[PDB]
Design an enzyme around this catalytic site. Structure first.
Site, PDB file in Angstrom:
ATOM      1  N   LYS A  96       0.829  -1.199   0.000  1.00  0.00           N
ATOM      2  CA  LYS A  96       0.000   0.000   0.000  1.00  0.00           C
ATOM      3  C   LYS A  96       0.873   1.263   0.000  1.00  0.00           C
ATOM      4  CE  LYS A  96      -2.763  -3.440   0.940  1.00  0.00           C
ATOM      5  NZ  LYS A  96      -3.953  -3.282   1.821  1.00  0.00           N
ATOM      6  N   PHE A 112     -18.001  -1.572   3.033  1.00  0.00           N
ATOM      7  CA  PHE A 112     -18.315  -0.154   2.838  1.00  0.00           C
ATOM      8  C   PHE A 112     -17.397   0.690   3.724  1.00  0.00           C
ATOM      9  CE2 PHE A 112     -22.374  -2.119   1.536  1.00  0.00           C
ATOM     10  CZ  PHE A 112     -22.490  -1.557   0.281  1.00  0.00           C
ATOM     11  N   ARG A 139       2.809  -8.343   8.276  1.00  0.00           N
ATOM     12  CA  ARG A 139       1.784  -7.337   8.541  1.00  0.00           C
ATOM     13  C   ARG A 139       2.047  -6.654   9.877  1.00  0.00           C
ATOM     14  NH1 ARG A 139      -2.934  -8.831   4.482  1.00  0.00           N
ATOM     15  NH2 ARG A 139      -4.243  -7.844   6.071  1.00  0.00           N
ATOM     16  N   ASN A 174      -3.587  -2.148   6.503  1.00  0.00           N
ATOM     17  CA  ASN A 174      -2.862  -3.407   6.395  1.00  0.00           C
ATOM     18  C   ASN A 174      -1.768  -3.241   5.350  1.00  0.00           C
ATOM     19  OD1 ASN A 174      -4.400  -5.012   8.287  1.00  0.00           O
ATOM     20  ND2 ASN A 174      -6.051  -5.035   6.765  1.00  0.00           N
ATOM     21  N   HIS A 203      -1.874  -7.075   0.833  1.00  0.00           N
ATOM     22  CA  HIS A 203      -3.098  -7.730   0.405  1.00  0.00           C
ATOM     23  C   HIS A 203      -2.694  -8.707  -0.691  1.00  0.00           C
ATOM     24  CE1 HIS A 203      -6.773  -8.423  -1.895  1.00  0.00           C
ATOM     25  NE2 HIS A 203      -7.528  -7.709  -1.082  1.00  0.00           N
TER      26      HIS A 203
END
Lengths: 46, 51, 145, 46, 201, 239, 181, 75
Positions: E16, E62, E110, E120, E123
């Protein structure tokens, strides 16, 4: 039937086209087919 | 030019390309590194024969 | 043996950074066309048929080498003649080369411009493990920084 | 008109055969990888 | 799978924008652990891309922060592959929630790089079928799956390709145009059922 | 020439004797790296110099993927301040035919024969690239995708192939490129061996100041035009 | 029947330069067989924006808009519209840059710093005397064409000259000796 | 497709007398040299590995003479 006209016209091209599309499984097979036919000319005619 | 107070005066003749003159302000030297020909704006005219 | 063979593909499947293809898929295609046509003439055509197989919103990343270049253009925008002295040093295999010497010379020029210095000499270069040092012997005029 | 029975059945068979030939190619390639590398570990250690 | 053929397992693996700066250490641990990297690529997912990438789970997740943490800078996706790829990558990762991994798995990547539940560090594929879905999303035109040799290719063509291709070729037969490939390809581009009609005027 | 010609004095190693000072060399290294940043070129080779009567135009050329593309030219008078020179056409080639003389340092200079010195710079650089930009045989490999790439497996020419003009190519649109053996006049190229004959130096006689570098032992090559910037129309007299 | 809703959606220059994607949530007035409900079957329509789409390019989604009991839905999400930028004005495949050059820099050699839509920076020479109708074309460096994304049009660099607001009498003599001779 | 792969083994290569090489042996050598860590761009390199496996000092004597005369410069 109209098979003979399109027997001569397309032949191997559609075969390779959907073979590649089925192998790749893109999100938009129809656009992939159109682009592949363009590229197929760009190799064959040129 | 970035350090001008240690520069060396460069001279480019423009009559004999590759000809150079140099000086630190005290000493000097000369040097030619061209093809040995004189520059001319006009194309080389072979000289006409005698009359 | 198994780990060796799947390592062999996972190597061979590695996508090229230029063409976008991988050697494993190319070899599959070239063997497919070779088995289809059966050249007789099988070995000679392996080059030409390989050319035949190659016939048939983008982000950008860049290295840490341009932040130094971003840093070092300021070099090119009361010292000693450092290049001359290094040329005397370079006559017996001592110095940093002309490029690094000129870079340090311009760095010393920035140092002299920044601070009120009477003499700003290239003291030396002490080598280090992660990063070397470029030491400058400085003698101040007013005593202020 | 009725190409749905005429020509697409032939072409589906040809896609099946071309994908079969492709699988033959992939298999032959895989045997080549095995042969090369098994020749490598066996002979390299001897 | 019990063919003459031999098989490579493949898995997606992401970093990320708050961990991309440590891409190099993560790749070092990935290679040292025994993985082999097939392809790298630098991404920048707009929120539309984020909504489509998690589309198997975006209808339940969401989380606007989860869209921002893909959209707030670039990503580094990789295909990794080795003996039991997904399980080994899961073992290196640990629990999906980094708040649990921080205290319970010291060795986890992680825990080392991640921050919290939505921040996190990594992925990747949680399932082989999920592996094919995400890898076919992010890196188009890379073969990852077994080839559908048999009836599956026919079903794929009949469900996606044939309902357009039949009708287009039928009109091509009515017209009998010259150099028929232009008529077919431009027809497929113009009247794709999966796309809107574009009027460049 | 590439950045390897600016870490060491490859230009002056050719024996032509004209090149860059270490000041200009280090400045050019940083500036061409910043040009490759600002302009997303695959490579940024130093084209050379147009020695003017007031200041010299330091010239750089952008290289795309796709190296036979219409290469993008840049100029700089104070080395580092690089500026995108416009591209060349046929009209601007015909425009400067009425003008002769040495370049002026200010590119805003005007000739009454008006004509801008920038147009002269553009046209003369284009003419030099079409005429005497050198590529050794096999250094560039025409990719099957309709694009030219570096032949990154290129081994330098054998010493038997060093002496032939056929082993050198015009770096422009057209083994795909045209060879130098048809570059009339037949004696228009001078081939000489320096530095223990680990160095091939190939200088243009039609465009003086060009000197093409090549190391046969490796793939280190490049061409630089450091010179006056005119065409030697006197070449058949001089041969 | 009822008309399609000609929705306008604004795309900045980088979206139409790089070819982004866009999502537009649509109405919930989809009818069942009962012909009095109001539900939704497809929440989001996605448009693959390709490079070079001009303003007014119509993207139409037949059978996706609002629907009454006895009419065919339709919708024209979206008409391509351009956001204001700092700064290029969108024309037919050409970008028009305005550089606030100061006077004195207008009349002499100048270099114009142009950030592009590629995130590339350009130093364009300006050796002509910049009067207030001058523009330099930077060819082949505009936006991509819609018919060919590999090819791109030309960038136009116009100039808004900033004249001085005050001049010393020395500066008046400076200028009179320079310009009127 | 077991009959088909049997035919595939049966071909590669009834030896081509024009060169005397085999697709199995040639491609095997090509892949063997590739599996010594060619890079991710190895797909663009097989065109001249094929040339090398298919293929499988007096010229620079003037270099030694110029070196030989130059010994007297510093000797």
């Amino acid at each position: 039937m109209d098979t003979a006209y399109l027997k001569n016209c397309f032949g191997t091209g559609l075969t390779q086209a959907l073979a590649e599309v089925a192998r790749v499984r893109p999100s938009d097979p129809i656009e992939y087919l159109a682009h592949w036919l363009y590229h197929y000319r760009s190799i064959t005619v040129a | 030019n970035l350090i001008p107070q240690y520069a060396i005066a460069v001279l480019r003749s423009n009559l004999w390309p590759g000809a150079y003159a140099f000086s630190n302000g005290k000493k000097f030297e000369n040097f030619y590194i061209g093809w040995g020909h004189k520059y001319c704006v006009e194309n080389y005219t072979p000289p006409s024969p005698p009359p | 043996l198994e780990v060796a063979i799947q390592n062999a593909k996972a190597y061979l499947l590695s996508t090229s950074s230029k063409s976008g293809l991988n050697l494993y898929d190319h070899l599959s295609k070239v063997l497919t066309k070779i088995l289809d046509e059966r050249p007789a003439d099988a070995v000679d055509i392996i080059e030409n048929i390989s050319q035949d197989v190659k016939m048939a919103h983008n982000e950008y990343e860049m290295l840490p080498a341009y932040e130094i270049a971003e840093t070092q253009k300021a070099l090119f925008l009361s010292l000693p003649n450092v290049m001359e002295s290094a040329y005397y040093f370079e006559q017996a295999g001592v110095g940093l080369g002309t490029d690094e010497t000129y870079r340090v010379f311009l760095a010393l020029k920035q140092l002299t411009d920044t601070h009120p210095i009477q003499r700003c000499r290239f003291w030396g270069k002490i080598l280090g493990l992660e990063m070397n040092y470029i030491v400058a012997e400085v003698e101040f005029r007013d005593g202020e920084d | 008109r009725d190409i749905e029975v005429g020509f697409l059945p032939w072409l589906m068979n040809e896609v099946e055969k071309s994908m079969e030939h492709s699988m033959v190619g992939r298999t032959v390639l895989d045997m080549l990888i095995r042969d090369v590398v098994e020749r490598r570990i066996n002979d390299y250690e001897h | 799978m019990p063919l003459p053929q031999i098989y490579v397992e493949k898995t997606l693996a992401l970093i990320k924008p708050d961990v991309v700066d440590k891409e190099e250490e993560i790749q070092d641990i990935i290679l040292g652990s025994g993985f082999t990297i097939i392809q790298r690529r630098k991404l920048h997912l707009s929120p539309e891309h984020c909504s489509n990438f998690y589309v198997e789970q975006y209808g339940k997740m969401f989380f606007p922060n989860l869209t921002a943490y893909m959209s707030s800078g670039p990503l580094v996706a990789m295909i990794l592959a080795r003996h039991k790829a997904i399980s080994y990558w899961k073992e290196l990762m640990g629990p999906s929630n980094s708040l649990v991994a921080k205290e319970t798995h010291p060795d986890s990547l992680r825990a080392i790089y991640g921050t919290d539940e939505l921040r996190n560090a990594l992925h990747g594929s949680n399932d082989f079928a999920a592996s094919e879905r995400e890898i076919r999303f992010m890196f188009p035109a890379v073969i990852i799956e077994p080839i559908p040799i048999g009836q599956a290719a026919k079903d794929y063509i009949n469900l996606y390709v044939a309902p357009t291709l039949l009708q287009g070729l039928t009109e091509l037969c009515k017209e009998k145009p010259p150099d028929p490939y232009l008529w077919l390809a431009d027809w497929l581009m113009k009247n794709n059922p999966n796309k809107p009609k574009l009027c460049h005027f | 020439m590439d950045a390897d010609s600016l870490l060491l004095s490859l230009e002056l190693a050719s024996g032509s004797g004209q090149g860059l000072s270490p000041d200009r060399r280090a400045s050019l290294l940083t500036s061409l790296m910043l040009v490759k940043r600002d302009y997303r070129f695959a490579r940024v080779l130093f084209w050379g110099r147009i020695l003017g009567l007031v200041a010299d135009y330091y010239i750089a050329q952008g290289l795309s993927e796709d190296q036979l593309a219409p290469r993008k030219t840049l100029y700089s008078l104070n080395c580092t301040e690089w500026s995108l020179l416009p591209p060349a056409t046929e009209e601007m080639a015909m425009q400067i035919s009425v003008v002769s003389g040495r370049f002026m340092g200010d590119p805003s200079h005007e000739y009454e024969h008006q004509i801008k010195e920038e147009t002269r710079l553009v046209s003369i650089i284009d003419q030099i690239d079409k005429a005497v930009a050198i590529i050794p045989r096999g250094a560039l490999f025409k990719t099957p995708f309709g694009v030219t790439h570096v032949n990154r497996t290129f081994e330098g020419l054998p010493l038997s192939e060093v002496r032939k003009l056929s082993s050198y190519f015009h770096f422009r649109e057209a083994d795909f490129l045209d060879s130098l053996e048809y570059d009339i006049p037949r004696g228009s190229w001078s081939i000489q061996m320096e530095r223990g004959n680990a160095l091939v130096v190939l200088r243009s006689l039609l465009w003086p100041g060009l000197t093409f570098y090549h190391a046969p032992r490796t793939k280190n090559y490049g061409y630089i035009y450091v010179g006056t910037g005119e065409k030697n129309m006197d070449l058949p007299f001089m041969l | 029947q009822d008309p399609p809703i000609e929705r306008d959606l604004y795309l900045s220059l980088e979206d139409l330069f790089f070819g982004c994607t866009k999502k537009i949530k649509i109405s919930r007035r989809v009818l069942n067989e009962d012909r009095y409900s109001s539900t939704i079957k497809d929440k989001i329509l996605t448009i693959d924006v390709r490079p070079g789409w001009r303003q007014g390019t119509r993207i139409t989604f037949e059978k996706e808009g609002d629907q009454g009991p006895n009419i065919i839905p339709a919708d024209i999400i979206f008409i391509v519209k351009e956001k204001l930028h700092p700064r290029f004005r969108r024309e037919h495949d050409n970008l028009f840059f305005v550089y606030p050059i100061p006077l004195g820099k207008a009349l002499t050699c100048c270099t114009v710093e142009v950030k592009t839509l590629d995130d590339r920076l350009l130093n364009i020479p300006i050796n002509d005397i910049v009067h207030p109708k001058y523009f330099k074309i930077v060819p082949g460096e505009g936006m991509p064409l819609p018919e060919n994304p590999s090819k791109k049009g030309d960038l136009f660099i116009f100039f808004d000259i900033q004249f001085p607001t005050r001049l010393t009498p020395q500066k008046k003599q400076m200028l009179r000796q320079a310009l009127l001779t």
